[PDB]
């Protein structure tokens, strides 16, 4: 196994595609601020 649940090893991700490279679901093809209009909040951590 390769452990992938380290908290500090994950960072904020880019806008993804949901079906294919031609899928404009989360406005991933947008070249403006609309590229980030579908980003909801996400906190990734490990409770101290």
């Amino acid at each position: 196994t390769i452990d992938m649940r380290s908290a500090y090893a994950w960072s904020l991700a880019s806008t993804p595609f949901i079906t294919s490279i031609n899928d404009n679901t989360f406005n991933a093809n947008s070249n403006t601020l609309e590229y980030g209009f579908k980003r909801a909040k996400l906190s990734w951590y490990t409770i101290d």
Binding site: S6, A7, Y8, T46, D48
Partner: protein, 367 residues
């Protein structure tokens, strides 16, 4: 194989730390009085022949792999009168200094950590009668065997324990062919609150409460030859974890484990006698034994043979032990070796335990 071993914290308290007792099959509760008699039976410290003594003992772990992983012990006893004695010991199991590096730069400050586990105890032994003595010991045990990383806390876990010991040594009684000596001893060890490594009251582990009862007889020949044959029985005072189930499938196991872990140590000591489907015939299996014979020549040469047997269903640590001891003027050197006889790889195999003791002060006669 091993069925339902007892899960107790700080197990290193149950490991022999001195070469003399380790050469006797890990028994010291009924043997002759010595400086190392703190882990086994402090009550015979009042029967020591010398005013005071110090001792350093070494037990290497994984000798073939690497050094600095070992259990050391420093003991110091001193009897002020012929009836009382104060002793203090310090056991320390450590992996040695370990460097933490995450960069290949030669010029890079490296953090050195030594995951360790020590126990410092002090005992007072009072000779009540002319042949019987008692002893009370208080021990503080700290464990720092983990390394601090992200989301992991390496805070040391500490606990306290109380040991009550008693030792009886009759006078030299003459027989048809020899003038032997009878000895007996009992010791209840590690009586204290649970130690929590996670620093949570819900997840706490019982201290390895132990009960040792031993007896021995010494045959004396020619006034300068001794042969002491001793036998010790050892039993843990911790309730046995549930096995298959004692009420779906995993619900019974979870309920049994929750009931087992929600038991106080005071209640657990009394619950140790039983808590199993088997009767007294199966309850006798919980008692391990050790039989040893020590030959003393001129009180300066010692050859020790021992056989220590645990139950195959728990622990399963059966072995023989050889030991030698030499006293030149005031320094006793003891070396012990272990021949395993169990199906499980004993971590003490190919290990020559060492002990070095200096005895000094006035000499007290032995009754």
């Amino acid at each position: 194989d091993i069925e339902r071993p007892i899960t107790t914290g700080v197990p290193f308290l149950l490991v022999a730390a001195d070469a003399r007792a380790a050469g006797l099959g890990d028994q010291g509760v009924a043997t002759s009085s010595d400086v190392f008699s703190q882990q086994w039976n402090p009550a015979k410290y009042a029967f020591a022949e010398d005013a005071q003594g110090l001792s350093i003992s070494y037990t290497p772990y994984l000798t073939d792999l690497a050094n600095d992983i070992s259990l050391g012990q420093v003991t110091y006893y001193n009897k002020i009168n012929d009836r009382s004695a104060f002793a203090g010991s310090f056991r320390y199991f450590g992996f040695g200094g370990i460097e933490l590096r995450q960069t290949g730069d030669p010029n890079e400050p490296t953090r050195e950590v030594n995951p360790n586990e020590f126990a410092l105890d002090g005992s007072y032994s009072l000779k009540l009668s002319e042949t019987f003595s008692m002893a009370v010991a208080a021990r503080y045990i700290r464990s720092n065997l983990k390394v601090a990383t992200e989301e992991i806390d390496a805070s040391a876990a500490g606990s306290f324990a109380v040991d009550v010991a008693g030792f009886y040594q009759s006078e030299e009684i003459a027989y048809s062919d020899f003038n032997g000596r009878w000895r007996a001893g009992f010791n209840i060890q590690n009586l204290g609150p649970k130690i929590s490594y996670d620093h949570d009251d819900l997840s706490a582990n019982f201290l390895p409460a132990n009960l040792r009862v031993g007896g021995g007889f010494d045959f004396i020949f020619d006034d300068y030859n001794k042969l002491g044959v001793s036998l010790e029985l050892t039993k843990l005072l911790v309730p046995t974890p549930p096995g298959p189930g004692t009420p779906s499938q995993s619900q019974a196991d979870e309920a049994n484990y929750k009931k087992y872990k929600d038991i106080g140590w005071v209640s657990g000591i009394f619950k140790s006698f039983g808590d199993a489907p088997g009767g007294f015939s199966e309850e006798l299996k919980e008692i391990t034994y050790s039989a040893a014979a020590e030959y003393m020549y001129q009180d300066a040469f010692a050859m020790r043979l021992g056989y220590y047997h645990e139950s195959p269903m728990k622990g399963a640590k059966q072995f023989f032990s050889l030991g030698a001891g030499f006293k030149y003027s005031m320094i006793k050197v003891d070396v012990s070796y272990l021949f395993s006889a169990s199906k499980v790889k004993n971590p003490l195999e190919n290990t020559l335990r060492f002990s070095l003791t200096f005895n000094f002060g006035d000499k007290y006669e032995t009754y």
